[PDB]
Amino acid sequence: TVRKNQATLTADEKRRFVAAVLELKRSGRYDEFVRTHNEFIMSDTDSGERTGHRSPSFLPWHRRFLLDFEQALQSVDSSVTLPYWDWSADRTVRASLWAPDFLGGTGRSTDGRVMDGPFAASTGNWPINVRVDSRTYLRRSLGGSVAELPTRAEVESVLAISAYDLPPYNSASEGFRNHLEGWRGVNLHNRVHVWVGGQMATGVSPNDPVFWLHHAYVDKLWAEWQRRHPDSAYVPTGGTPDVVDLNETMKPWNTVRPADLLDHTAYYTFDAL
Amino acid sequence: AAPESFDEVYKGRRIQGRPAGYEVFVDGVQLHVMRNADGSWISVVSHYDPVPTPRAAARAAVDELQGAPLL
Numbered sequence A: 001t002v003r004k005n006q007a008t009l010t011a012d013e014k015r016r017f018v019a020a021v022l023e024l025k026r027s028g029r030y031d032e033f034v035r036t037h038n039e040f041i042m043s044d045t046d047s048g049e050r051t052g053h054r055s056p057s058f059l060p061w062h063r064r065f066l067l068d069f070e071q072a073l074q075s076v077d078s079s080v081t082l083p084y085w086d087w088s089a090d091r092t093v094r095a096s097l098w099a100p101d102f103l104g105g106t107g108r109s110t111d112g113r114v115m116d117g118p119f120a121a122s123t124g125n126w127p128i129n130v131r132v133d134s135r136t137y138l139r140r141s142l143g144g145s146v147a148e149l150p151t152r153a154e155v156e157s158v159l160a161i162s163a164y165d166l167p168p169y170n171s172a173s174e175g176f177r178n179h180l181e182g183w184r185g186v187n188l189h190n191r192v193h194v195w196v197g198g199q200m201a202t203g204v205s206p207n208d209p210v211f212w213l214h215h216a217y218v219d220k221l222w223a224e225w226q227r228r229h230p231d232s233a234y235v236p237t238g239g240t241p242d243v244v245d246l247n248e249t250m251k252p253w254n255t256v257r258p259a260d261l262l263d264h265t266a267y268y269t270f271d272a273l
Numbered sequence B: 001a002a003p004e005s006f007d008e009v010y011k012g013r014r015i016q017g018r019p020a021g022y023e024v025f026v027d028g029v030q031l032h033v034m035r036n037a038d039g040s041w042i043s044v045v046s047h048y049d050p051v052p053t054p055r056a057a058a059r060a061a062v063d064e065l066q067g068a069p070l071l
């Protein structure tokens, strides 16, 4: 129940994480996670109903989504937990994260195809099934579309924002949530998707296993923000059309509310907070 | 007020746009696009990278596709 920095994983932990992810893929369970995410990212809009993105529920939603995935992983290997990627620290293509024994590296220049690691198309173990175009192989272009990943200094500036979110509760909002998501400001979360490229830059981003590590760190940053701002909490707190209020239930689960997900310690802890 | 329609061949591929709130096509296949509160646009092939216009989104898609047909 402890989520660790990907850079600190042992060879066995990396091996077990990879094996668990590959089994979820083989069994067909993995692709359904990709589909769910794509469906919400395609429907969430600034002017209408928004639940998974560009809205206050962006954080609790991805928190629950990751929990669903971690639980599925644990059904294969109970020792496995989601590791997180601190992209402000491990910001180069030579990060152990992109090694052949973990996630594999960047894609070749011709078609962006990842050529090494356990998820390379050549292994026959990672077919891209849920997609927007005909390409069926994992693609990446680390640092191709955007020059740099966020810096610690930039992350600190966002963590310093006191208000969790603010009307109109969408991509135009000031406040922590939108700055962490990245639609406004120095851009943290969105920029990382862009930096990785390939499927990670599209609606079917969970096709790349790094998706979970990226969001696990985004999730950790929410936890860090809570520690810095004990007097700040989730908003809105009632009667907001198209937005998930604190005590309202979230789709697709329908049985959980942001209020049930604010405290992560009920589900897991971090190696260091 | 929705943006104007457009029709051109970009990097060997035909891209079209037309108000509906707005539809975009790459070689006759529709490309799902979305408008942000500030007026910028994103597409299903570039969902976390806002661009100024629907044509910009269409061209970005063609760039990303590298010749691949949209589904």
Ligand SMILES: [O-][O-]
Pocket: A053, A205
């Ligand atoms: O947000 O993926």
Ligand SMILES: [Cu+2]
Pocket: A042, B032
């Ligand atoms: Cu739509």
Ligand SMILES: [Cu+2]
Pocket: A037, A041, A052, A053
């Ligand atoms: Cu998402």
Ligand SMILES: [Cu+2]
Pocket: A189, A193, A215
């Ligand atoms: Cu994301």
Ligand SMILES: [Cu+2]
Pocket: none
């Ligand atoms: Cu204090």
